[PDB]
Design a protein around this ligand. Structure first.
Ligand SMILES: [Mg+2]
Ligand SMILES: [Mg+2]
Lengths: 83, 83
């Protein structure tokens, strides 16, 4: 097993800009084969042996987002900086 | 006496973008001759008879801001959307 990865339970929600139903991140990361444990609002995720590409939280975020589907991410123009 | 005017105690602070010291609004409005009573977080302000220009909370905001000095108002860029 690779080293474990720690990330906040709502990190995929923030990156995607979507409030996923509760348990979505934990369910999806287990679905792809990782061991997921809870410590407050922080998940400790140990990827499976066949997923050496999962090394940091950003990798985990892609798994949740692609399985939930990118079509649920809304189109929200960010505010204009004072260019 | 003109009709009384109800205004939140922090209204001038919000419009100025400045956190004035405690009691600033009540002190300035009493200086210009108004009768000021406190109802929790809401002021009831009765302007003096020589100030018929004071009819709305915005009129009272101008009194506080001009006497505190507009130079204390900071310079921050607004959050304009993408045009
Ligand atoms: Mg990936
Ligand atoms: Mg005025």
């Amino acid at each position: 097993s690779p080293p474990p990865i720690r990330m906040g339970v709502d990190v995929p929600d923030r990156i995607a800009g979507v409030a996923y139903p509760q348990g979505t991140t934990a369910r999806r990361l287990a679905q792809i084969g990782a061991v997921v444990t809870h410590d407050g609002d922080t998940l400790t995720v140990t990827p499976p042996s066949w997923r050496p590409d999962l090394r940091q939280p950003a990798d985990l975020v892609e798994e949740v987002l692609r399985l939930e589907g990118l079509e649920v991410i809304p189109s929200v123009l960010p505010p204009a900086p004072a260019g």
